[PDB]
């Protein structure tokens, strides 16, 4: 996955992807790429026109029109690539921030926020508890009593 978890309980440790947020991000990136392709399908297509030596003014007009249209569409392609690259990197940063906020608002004061992306659990969070915090189904009042306790006995 693009985004995920690393639990470190007593039963072991290892990585696990958040498939929901990763699938939503992959859907968004795929639809962004398809939209970038589809919006620039109506680009100017230059065709060959020839002019004689007494038609140099219309020839210069034609080459200036075609060069200007190629410059306009080159600017459009380059600027869309730059702007959507910023939007994609900020989208990934927002996805990691939203996953962190989702876990932080799940755990509340039952976990200590270590400030480096990790959460120090006050209660004993086994593999079922890690799967519960992985798919948004962590139950606060099951573990809140021992978390508040462990806060008292660790303080």
């Amino acid at each position, epitope marked *: *996955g*693009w985004y995920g978890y690393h639990h470190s309980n007593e039963q072991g440790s290892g990585y696990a*992807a958040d*498939k929901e947020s*990763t*699938q939503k991000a*992959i*859907d968004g*990136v*795929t639809n962004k*790429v*398809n939209s970038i*392709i589809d919006k620039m399908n109506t680009q100017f297509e230059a065709v060959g026109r020839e002019f004689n030596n007494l038609e140099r003014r219309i020839e210069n007009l034609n080459k200036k029109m075609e060069d200007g249209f190629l410059d306009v569409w080159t600017y459009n392609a380059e600027l869309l690539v730059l702007m959507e690259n910023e939007r994609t990197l900020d989208f990934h940063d927002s996805n990691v921030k939203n996953l962190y906020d989702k876990v932080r608002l799940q755990l509340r004061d039952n976990a200590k926020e270590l400030g480096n992306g990790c959460f120090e659990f006050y209660h004993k969070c086994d593999n079922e508890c890690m799967e519960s915090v992985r798919n948004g189904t962590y139950d606060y009042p099951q573990y809140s009593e021992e978390a508040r306790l462990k806060r008292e006995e660790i303080s």
Partner: nanobody
Framework: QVQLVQSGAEVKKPGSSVKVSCKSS????????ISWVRQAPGQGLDWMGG????????AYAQKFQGRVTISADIFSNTAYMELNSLTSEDTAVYFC??????????????WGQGTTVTVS
């Protein structure tokens, strides 16, 4: 709905290579993993590998590593599978199969019609 349309049947000599495509019709498949599963005559299904193109993952089986090449085109919505150094053991029916999400853990809910490769 999305239907996976593969190429026609191939008749090959030993020592050659075969390239099988899997065009995703009726919708894109760039946000799902498309696996390549072969089926020998009289035997069971066997996983060769897969590609998750937007996700950027290209996985291969350990018994097929270094011999099969799997690529994807996201502008034509086509996933390709190239198998080199064909022998008589490579005679099978080759299926492309789209997973339920971006990776290979989920069930393959959309399958291609199959491509029969006979090496002789």
């Amino acid at each position: 709905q999305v239907q996976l349309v593969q190429s026609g049947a191939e008749v090959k000599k030993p020592g050659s290579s075969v390239k099988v495509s899997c065009k995703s019709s009726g919708g894109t498949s760039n946000n799902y993993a498309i696996s390549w599963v072969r089926q020998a005559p009289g035997q069971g299904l066997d996983w060769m590998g897969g590609i998750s193109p937007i996700f950027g993952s290209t996985a291969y089986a350990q018994k097929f590593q270094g011999r099969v090449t799997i690529s994807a085109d996201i502008f034509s919505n086509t996933a390709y599978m190239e198998l080199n150094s064909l022998t008589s053991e490579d005679t099978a029916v080759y299926f492309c199969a789209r997973h339920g999400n971006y990776y290979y853990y989920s069930g393959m809910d959309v399958w291609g019609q199959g491509t029969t490769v006979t090496v002789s």
